[PDB]
Design a protein around this nucleic acid. Structure first.
Ligand SMILES: [Mg+2]
Ligand SMILES: [Mg+2]
Ligand SMILES: [Mg+2]
Ligand SMILES: [Mg+2]
Ligand SMILES: [Mg+2]
Ligand SMILES: [Mg+2]
Ligand SMILES: [Mg+2]
Ligand SMILES: [Mg+2]
Ligand SMILES: [Mg+2]
Ligand SMILES: [Mg+2]
Ligand SMILES: [Mg+2]
Ligand SMILES: [Mg+2]
Ligand SMILES: [Mg+2]
Ligand SMILES: [Mg+2]
Ligand SMILES: [Mg+2]
Ligand SMILES: [Mg+2]
Ligand SMILES: [Mg+2]
Ligand SMILES: [Mg+2]
Ligand SMILES: [Mg+2]
Ligand SMILES: [Mg+2]
Ligand SMILES: [Mg+2]
Ligand SMILES: [Mg+2]
Ligand SMILES: [Mg+2]
Ligand SMILES: [Mg+2]
Ligand SMILES: [Mg+2]
Ligand SMILES: [Mg+2]
Ligand SMILES: [Mg+2]
Ligand SMILES: [Mg+2]
Ligand SMILES: [Mg+2]
Ligand SMILES: [Mg+2]
Ligand SMILES: [Mg+2]
Ligand SMILES: [Mg+2]
Ligand SMILES: [Mg+2]
Ligand SMILES: [Mg+2]
Ligand SMILES: [Mg+2]
Lengths: 199, 394, 153
RNA sequence: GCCACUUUUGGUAAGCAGAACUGGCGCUGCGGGAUGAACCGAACGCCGGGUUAAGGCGCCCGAUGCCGACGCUCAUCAGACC
RNA sequence: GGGUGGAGCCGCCGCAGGUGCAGAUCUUGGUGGUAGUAGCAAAUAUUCAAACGAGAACUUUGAAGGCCGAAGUGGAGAAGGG
RNA sequence: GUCCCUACCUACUAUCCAGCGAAACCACAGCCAAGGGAACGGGCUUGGCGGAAUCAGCGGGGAAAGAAGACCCUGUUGAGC
RNA sequence: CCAAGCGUUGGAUUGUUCACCCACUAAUAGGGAACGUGAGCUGGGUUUAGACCGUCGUGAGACAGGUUAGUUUUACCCUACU
RNA sequence: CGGCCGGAAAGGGGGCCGCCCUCUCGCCCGUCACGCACCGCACGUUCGUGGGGAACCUGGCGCUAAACCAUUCGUAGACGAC
């Protein structure tokens, strides 16, 4: 009942435009690894856009001015709350069901995370266009934790491969057991093949 | 319309919430960046501002007019008794920052350090760490509190030791010892922690933290000067004599149509007692404290090899509003932030320093120890009575 | 005379009232709200070191311009003041109610102030003399106090 | 009295001043043009069902979450609806 | 309907009017916020003990310290006050 | 010390308390940017965002308060000369 | 060209904005914020009533002509800022 | 029911080794009949020993504190605060 979205290779507003709607329809969304969100257009236009957003500080009290969040997860959080009606209390109760994370933290590392094909870079950009990584943009606009989160994600990848090797081993033991068992499950399999599940 | 005559603005906006400092002890906002090549060492220390005096030294800078001449230079005495290490704490780098991991305290910690955990030591019954210190005297706890060192040697990147001043040895009214995390910068994390768990519940002096002619940074809170006006705090121009509603003001706050008053406009509020970091203060001399050697104590911690007296660093009649410095001290170049008898933090420098003034060797040849409670005329009590002669009272 | 709040039992409750008392309403209201839940001995011990400036009255509603005090921190508030006309009038009123309890034959040491109430009285009039030949009103704001004590262990 | 299509006078011109025809606003809500006296649709008793106009259908926001069609377009100032 | 209230009131058909209030910088009366706020700051200054008293920074007596300084903060008038 | 260039000391304040305690003002009230608008919003729209109750100051803003503009024009309104 | 980060002064004359000149300088660039900024100040100028002079008017008086003297009121409210 | 490991970014109710017990039960076909068949009718079926709030119950092993005011300090100070 909790939707875990991946964040790698998803367009920024194209992902946010459906995260907003699933959140308004009552579905608790946790997007994860907001590092690898990429924005279309090239890096220099996107960095100029974010620096122009940094220029927008309130003249008399920049502490009361617009809080320019530098983390990638909170850039994505602010671009969802642009799309949500966050003044009204249904929009405020909406934003409480979006949970963004830089990298993949241990509540959600050992959980299978979902991919939107309808918001994805290889589907919604033609391949000669050049995109822009939100992680690199956030880093060199002033997010301090690129290298830390990169080493932690490398630590997670070298452990998820240890998990996946065992998963491969269990599937090979299964498909080597099935040929040993095909004499006594010959009639349990045949009623599955006649109903379209094992051929 | 514009300003007719351009002029730079008063004050700095970098220090902008000019409020009373929430802390009394100066806090290190950044320890020097660690590298696994150097041997392990503490990177901060605490001291107490005693007072000011002179120096005469011969300068060796080829190129100035003062090469092989002898300047005088103002210096600051910071009494630094050796600090007792009473714990360690580790830190793990997180994508949200740098979280504390596991604080481990020593077995026996002194009741000048135990004062810190109590807002009222008199009314209390002194019960802190009593159920905690019993873990060090049983095997049910010893295998508990060395397994966490084994986890601190796996998951921590930054190991910061936890020391405190030793206020039994100071001339002050206060007994509540200040305590401080000091980042240990050295080898791997195993070396870094198996260095400090032996320093646990024992001394660390100054001379194995700092050295002579090293530039350091002084952290501390300024001398508080109260709720003061805008010409006293922001140094704006005093309005002329003829003004009706007072002349020690800022005349125009702001323009019409930005319908607020900006955060950059000089206003009247708190002046002083601000936290400040002031870099590149040079150790001229690390003093050696009073110690008793063969019956009579040796006192000459202000004797140079060009003076050959038996005078201490203390002036006649002590440091004014401090007391007498009986401990080993650090003599900084120039003024530092803070009033008398104020706690200061000495931090090793964040910068790398290969400059002709930072690499200068300092060989003093006089230390003024005359009375600061007035125009002092005499260096020491012996020379004073040798010049005066027998008095009526003698 | 009908009070504003009836006691739940007149056999256990003893009552008192003071009409048209020349103290300030805004001070007396809040020094009554200070003692609206107290035992009678704790109430008199409170009202004496209100006069002796050792425990303060937290000015909570009528609190504009009232300076802060250190003693207000034990009421969970910042502002406080130590009024003494208001303290001594509803100290005499506790002596009245404590006389009425022994007139009714009640246990004095278990009385708790159940209900206390300060109303505005008919506002007496003086004048003051202001610049440019004008005269402005200079009223005094006295108060009606009523109080109900009730036995509870 | 004011505005608008087109015709038109003075003025460099004007959210300027002066005309003609017709429609509006003023006296007038409602849907659209984000916002709005005049623009586009449309004029009103209180309601239920259906359907449209002008305008829309990534999300705010009802509706393209069509396996919509054919091209053009890279902008270190893209472009985006009387 | 319920409560308070303690001496008069109303329906219909006609008649008559000083017949309906949110405004008039409206008239008269009362009451808020500001607000326990601004303030109670011109001319040097009070202190100790006792008494009466339910109660004393302020009264009175005693002591001490000050001031007006003979163009007075003194002693007496005229006008005015009654 | 008019200023360069401000600094320090004293008295009475302001400040805090015991007592006593008003008045001017007030449509509802108070956070900003831009848009349109009676052509310079606290309210509308789109954003930015928003945390009780409060204290000493301050003079930006409330196109702040006072006074049915005193300048200018209209009045078949007057007066002084 | 990228570029407003950091500077862009001290004075004689004048009420000056502009102007002109002396001297330093790295440079002595231009400007906007209700022609920024009077409950911030000053009141020199204009812009009240007193006065003198020139011109005009028979006259009261007039002068985008000159000169001289001429009260600059209030914050304790709310927001803002400290 | 006892031991071995797997966890740090916001830590794993997972795997494994023994034991004293226990079962031919569970799973897939068949045989046999029973269980309010509540008489056509709604929120049924769970995560649910849900989160919080009091008072009752019986036992076991453990706990006996600080904060704030008042006093003092003067590294601080309008008052608070420190
Ligand atoms: Mg300029
Ligand atoms: Mg003046
Ligand atoms: Mg001295
Ligand atoms: Mg209030
Ligand atoms: Mg106030
Ligand atoms: Mg008066
Ligand atoms: Mg008079
Ligand atoms: Mg026209
Ligand atoms: Mg016109
Ligand atoms: Mg009509
Ligand atoms: Mg219409
Ligand atoms: Mg539009
Ligand atoms: Mg048409
Ligand atoms: Mg319909
Ligand atoms: Mg739309
Ligand atoms: Mg009667
Ligand atoms: Mg009549
Ligand atoms: Mg009325
Ligand atoms: Mg009426
Ligand atoms: Mg006052
Ligand atoms: Mg006389
Ligand atoms: Mg006489
Ligand atoms: Mg005040
Ligand atoms: Mg008072
Ligand atoms: Mg509204
Ligand atoms: Mg203003
Ligand atoms: Mg005005
Ligand atoms: Mg008029
Ligand atoms: Mg006419
Ligand atoms: Mg006439
Ligand atoms: Mg102007
Ligand atoms: Mg003014
Ligand atoms: Mg102004
Ligand atoms: Mg003038
Ligand atoms: Mg004149």
């Amino acid at each position: 009942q909790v939707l875990v979205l991946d964040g790698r290779g998803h367009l920024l507003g194209r992902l946010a435009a459906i995260v907003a709607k699933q959140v308004l329809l009552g579905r608790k969304v946790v997007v994860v690894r907001c590092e690898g969100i990429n924005i279309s257009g090239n890096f220099y236009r996107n960095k100029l856009k974010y620096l122009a957003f940094l220029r927008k500080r309130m003249n008399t009290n920049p502490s009361r001015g617009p809080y320019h969040f530098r983390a990638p997860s909170r850039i994505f959080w602010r671009t969802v709350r642009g799309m949500l009606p966050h003044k009204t209390k249904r929009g405020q109760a909406a934003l409480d069901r979006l949970k963004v994370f830089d990298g993949i933290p241990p509540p959600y590392d050992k959980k299978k995370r979902m991919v939107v094909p309808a918001a994805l870079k290889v589907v919604r950009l033609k391949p000669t266009r050049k995109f822009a990584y939100l992680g690199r943009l956030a880093h060199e606009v002033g997010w301090k934790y690129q290298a830390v989160t990169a080493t932690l994600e490398e630590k997670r990848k070298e452990k998820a491969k240890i998990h996946y090797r065992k998963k491969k081993q269990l599937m090979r033991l299964r498909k080597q057991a099935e040929k040993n068992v095909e004499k006594k499950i010959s009639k349990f399999t045949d009623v599955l093949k006649t109903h379209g599940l094992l051929v | 319309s514009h300003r007719k005559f351009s002029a730079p603005r008063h004050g700095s906006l970098g220090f902008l919430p000019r409020k009373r400092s929430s802390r009394h002890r100066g806090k290190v906002k950044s320890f020097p960046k660690d590298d696994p090549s150097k041997p392990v060492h503490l990177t901060a220390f605490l001291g107490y501002k005693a007072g000011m005096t002179h120096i005469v030294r011969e300068v060796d800078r080829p190129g100035s007019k003062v090469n092989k001449k002898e300047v005088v230079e103002a210096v600051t005495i910071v009494e630094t008794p050796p600090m007792v290490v009473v714990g360690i704490v580790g830190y793990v780098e997180t994508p949200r920052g740098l979280r504390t991991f596991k604080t481990v305290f020593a077995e026996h910690i002194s009741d000048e350090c135990k004062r810190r955990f109590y807002k009222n030591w008199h009314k209390s019954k002194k019960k802190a760490f009593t159920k905690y210190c019993k873990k060090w005297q049983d095997d049910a706890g010893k295998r508990q509190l060395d397994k966490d060192f084994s986890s601190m040697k796996k998951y921590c990147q930054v190991i910061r030791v936890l020391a405190h001043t030793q206020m039994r040895l100071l001339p002050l009214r206060q007994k509540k010892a200040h305590l401080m995390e000091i980042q240990v910068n050295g080898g791997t994390v195993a070396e870094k922690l198996d260095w400090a768990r032996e320093r646990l519940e024992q001394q660390v002096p100054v001379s194995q933290v700092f050295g002579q002619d090293e530039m350091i940074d002084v952290i501390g809170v300024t001398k508080g000067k109260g709720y003061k006006g805008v010409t006293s705090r922001w140094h704006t121009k005093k309005l002329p004599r003829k003004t009706h509603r007072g002349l020690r003001k800022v005349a125009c706050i702001g323009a019409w149509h930005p319908a607020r008053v900006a955060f950059s406009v000089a206003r009247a509020g708190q002046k002083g007692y601000h936290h400040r970091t002031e870099i590149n203060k040079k150790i001229y001399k690390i003093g050696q404290g009073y110690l008793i050697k063969d019956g009579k104590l040796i006192k000459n911690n202000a004797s140079t090899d060009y003076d050959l007296s038996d005078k201490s660093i203390n002036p006649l009649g002590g440091f004014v509003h401090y007391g007498e410095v009986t401990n080993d001290f650090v003599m900084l170049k120039g003024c530092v932030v803070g009033t008398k008898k104020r706690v200061l933090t000495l931090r090793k420098s964040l910068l790398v320093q290969t400059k002709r003034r930072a690499l200068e060797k300092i060989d003093l040849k006089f230390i003024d120890t005359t009375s600061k409670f007035g125009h002092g005329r005499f260096q020491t009590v012996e020379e004073k009575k040798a010049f005066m002669g027998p008095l009526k009272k003698d | 005379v009908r009070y504003s709040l009836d006691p739940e039992n007149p056999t256990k409750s003893c009552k008192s009232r003071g009409s048209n008392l020349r103290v300030h309403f805004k001070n007396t209201r809040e020094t009554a709200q200070a003692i609206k839940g107290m035992h009678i001995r704790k109430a008199t011990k409170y009202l004496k070191d209100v006069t002796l400036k050792k425990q303060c009255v937290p000015f909570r509603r009528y609190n504009g311009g009232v300076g802060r005090c250190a003693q207000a921190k034990q009421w969970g508030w910042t502002q406080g003041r130590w009024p003494k006309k208001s303290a001594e009038f509803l100290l005499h009123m506790l002596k009245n109610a404590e006389s009425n309890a022994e007139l009714k034959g009640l246990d004095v040491d278990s009385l708790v102030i159940e209900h206390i109430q300060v109303n505005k009285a008919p506002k007496m009039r003086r004048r003051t003399y202001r610049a440019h030949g004008r005269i402005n009103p200079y009223m005094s704001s006295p108060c009606h106090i009523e109080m109900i004590l009730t036995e509870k262990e």
